[PDB]
Design a protein around this ligand. Structure first.
Ligand code: HEM
Length: 418
């Protein structure tokens, strides 16, 4: 009845793609009970993403207050509101320019050895148990761990520090849920205080003793421009990067593993050259999303129409990226897992010239898209090579959420013969 509630029901946390098809055909410009709109077709989603900046503005202070009424003047909402995802041009333009100057393709490629090293170490840790015929929850022992250890490497942080930060993130997000208790609010403000204090200390540390990591580069001088992120901007940028990769990459890894196990005839892509591996990962992304529906508010600047449906000035429009990715006008035979769609093409572009929507499009296109892609391209062949007879051990347990599609468990074992 209400698309956001329908998509969060258990069966739709499980397989929402039949309902998404229904929306695309029967209610493509869905108005929820709240008044927020939801676009499900590839064409309309692509349009809305590329119109962000002109036709759609970012959320104002009034918009965030309405979306987070319980936390309207809290430190935690102030921190969220300062992140790149919640900014609009021209402030967004400068902030994105400055982080992209230092968070580069070369910087990300320099993490590839570390991704292999972490994967090798975590897989070694469970090899004995798997060899004895036991079941391992790969989500808990691997998928959620690798992205955090890679953030530690990128930022120049300790493992202990990144795991405490992740715990703070969980607390903060709990405090921004609409049902949040006053106690969760207080815990969120305390965790937000700690996050700021931590990053302040990290910035000061790398400023005195720079290293090769991203924070050291961000806080040091730059030859071409003397523009740079201020300390308050730096805290917000590092925080927003962590939030962006908090649970998304882990869900991606989980989905890739599940696709490897469901379609063992496609494992060959992971055994091939760089172009072959990349194609598998592109199709993993096309096949599932970690949120489904978008988190960034897009506020209509004026009365818009999509078809004969009016979206009034001031309304909030969200997009169902996972539905666009299974739209047959963009991806023929959309329910088939087929990496050849993306073989030899530009990242996120099919052989027919239709774009993958898993990272968005336009000015808010995922800052971490290359980092996510490279993490998957390096770890998945290693997993496939270490445990050639890995199989699914039981049904994955999905993590109940109103906003995200993540797993609590991904149980795996080796195919054993007595
Ligand atoms: C597979 C993993 C990921 C997926 C599927 C994903 C998805 C997305 C999507 C769809 C958006 C745009 C949302 C919109 O336009 O409404 C976005 C934005 C963003 N992502 Fe990711 N993301 C992933 C991983 C990461 C990582 C590893 C980082 C680390 C830098 C990151 C940082 C960000 C940031 C900072 C933004 C805001 C960009 C802006 O507003 O200019 N994400 N992400």
């Amino acid at each position: 009845r209400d698309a956001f509630a329908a998509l969060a029901a258990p069966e739709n946390n499980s397989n929402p793609y039949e309902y998404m098809r229904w929306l695309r055909e029967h209610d493509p410009v869905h108005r929820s009970a709240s008044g927020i709109f939801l676009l499900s077709r590839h064409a309309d989603i692509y349009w809305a993403l590329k119109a962000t900046g002109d036709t759609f503005r970012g959320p104002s202070a009034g918009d965030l207050a309405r979306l987070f009424p319980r936390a309207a003047i809290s430190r935690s909402l102030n921190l969220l509101a300062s992140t790149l995802a919640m900014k609009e041009p021209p402030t967004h333009t400068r902030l994105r320019r400055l982080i992209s100057r230092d968070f580069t393709v070369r910087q990300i490629d320099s993490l590839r050895p570390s991704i292999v090293q972490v994967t090798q170490t975590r897989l070694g840790n469970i090899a004995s148990s798997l060899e004895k015929g036991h079941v391992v929850n790969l989500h808990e022992v691997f998928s959620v761990v690798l992205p955090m250890l890679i953030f530690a490497e990128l930022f120049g942080m300790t493992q202990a520090d990144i795991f405490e930060l992740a715990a703070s993130i969980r607390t903060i997000l709990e405090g921004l849920n609409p049902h949040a208790s006053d106690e969760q609010l207080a815990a969120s403000d305390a965790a937000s205080l700690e996050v700021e204090r931590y990053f302040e200390g990290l910035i000061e540390k790398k400023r005195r003793e720079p290293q090769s990591d991203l924070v050291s580069v961000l806080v040091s001088t730059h030859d071409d421009d003397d523009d740079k992120l201020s300390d308050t901007e730096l805290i917000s940028m590092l925080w927003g990067i962590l939030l962006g990769g908090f649970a998304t990459t882990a869900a991606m890894i989980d989905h890739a593993i599940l696709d490897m196990l469901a379609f063992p005839e496609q494992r060959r892509w992971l055994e091939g050259d760089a172009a072959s591996v990349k194609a598998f990962i592109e199709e993993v992304l096309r096949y599932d999303a970690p949120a489904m529906f978008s988190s960034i508010p897009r506020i209509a600047q004026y009365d818009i129409t999509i078809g004969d449906v009016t979206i009034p000035e001031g309304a909030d429009v969200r997009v169902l990226l996972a539905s666009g990715n299974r739209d047959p006008a963009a991806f023929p035979d959309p329910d088939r897992f087929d990496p050849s769609r993306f073989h030899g093409t530009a990242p996120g572009m099919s052989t027919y010239g239709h774009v993958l929507l898993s990272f968005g499009h336009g000015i808010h296109f995922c800052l971490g898209a290359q980092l996510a892609r490279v993490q998957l391209a390096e770890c998945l062949p290693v997993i496939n090579a270490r445990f050639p007879h890995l199989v699914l051990a039981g049904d994955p347990v999905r993590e109940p959420s109103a906003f995200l599609r993540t797993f609590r468990s991904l149980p795996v074992r080796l195919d054993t013969s007595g």
